[PDB]
């Protein structure tokens, strides 16, 4: 099929809310070894986010049931629930390894040293899915993925800070998810709050650098960063 029919199935699948098919189309596109456009990066990121996102949402529901029913004391149910949670964990892990394959083998690889914008995005994405794995991993397995998520975010942070405007949507989106990584995974609220505040302040400072093409996108992430900082600073006063 033509490469243009692929992306059109991606657009179509998105509207039909069939993200398994959307993530499949964009995978075929990616394997064509051609650099992805700005819309094509969007379609890929959304398709897999929805796929993996569903498993995460379910896994949280299942792991939740596993804590409420663990106090009951029925070993016939605790087994079937734990068995189910592992089923969802495998599905989730499968998707993550799939995207990370696309990233390291096709996307990140064919990025020249003047495609800062694309590389910062693919890396942030890579760090995101390694964090998803960290949400369901434990012990040495959890330690390895967290380290891999850090290495991805950290590198993306440097390339953004150096080659992107603080009002840039891609750089902003990185500061967000990266800060989320600290607070949730690393459990370092000070680092999470700081990175979120800084990325926000630095956006206000050079707020005149908003380009019309994507002012709406950049402005949107900024709300989330504050909504995050609000939510976080309210969780530190409960623990105290």
């Amino acid at each position: 099929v033509d490469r243009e029919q692929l992306v059109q199935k991606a657009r179509l699948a998105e509207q039909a809310e069939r993200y398994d098919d959307m993530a499949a189309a964009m995978k075929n596109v990616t394997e064509l070894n051609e650099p992805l456009s700005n819309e094509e990066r969007n379609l890929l990121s959304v398709a897999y986010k929805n796929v993996v996102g569903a498993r995460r949402s379910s896994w949280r529901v299942i792991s939740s049931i596993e804590q409420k029913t663990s106090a009951d004391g029925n070993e016939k149910k605790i087994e079937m629930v734990r068995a189910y949670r592992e089923k969802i964990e495998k599905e989730l892990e499968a998707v993550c390894q799939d995207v990370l394959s696309l990233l390291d083998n096709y996307l990140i690889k064919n990025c020249s040293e003047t495609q800062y914008e694309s590389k910062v995005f693919y890396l942030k994405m890579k760090g995101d899915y390694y964090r998803y794995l960290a949400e369901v991993a434990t012990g040495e397995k959890r330690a390895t993925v967290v380290e891999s998520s850090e290495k991805a975010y950290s590198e993306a942070h440097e390339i953004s800070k150096e080659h992107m405007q603080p009002t840039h949507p891609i750089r902003l989106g990185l500061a967000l998810n990266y800060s989320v990584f600290y607070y949730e995974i690393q459990n370092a609220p000070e680092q999470a709050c700081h990175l979120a505040k800084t990325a926000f302040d630095d956006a206000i400072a050079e707020l005149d650098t908003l380009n019309e093409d994507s002012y709406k996108d950049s402005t949107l992430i900024m709300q989330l960063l504050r909504d995050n900082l609000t939510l976080w600073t309210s969780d530190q006063q409960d623990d105290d």
């Binding site: 990066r41 949507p169 891609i170 989106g173 967000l176 989320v180 949730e184 996108d217 989330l224 995050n228």
Partner: peptide, 13 residues
């Protein structure tokens, strides 16, 4: 489980 807000989109046009 308690979660924060996140984003996964790039500027289309």
């Amino acid at each position: 489980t308690t979660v924060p807000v996140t984003t996964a989109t790039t500027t289309t046009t």
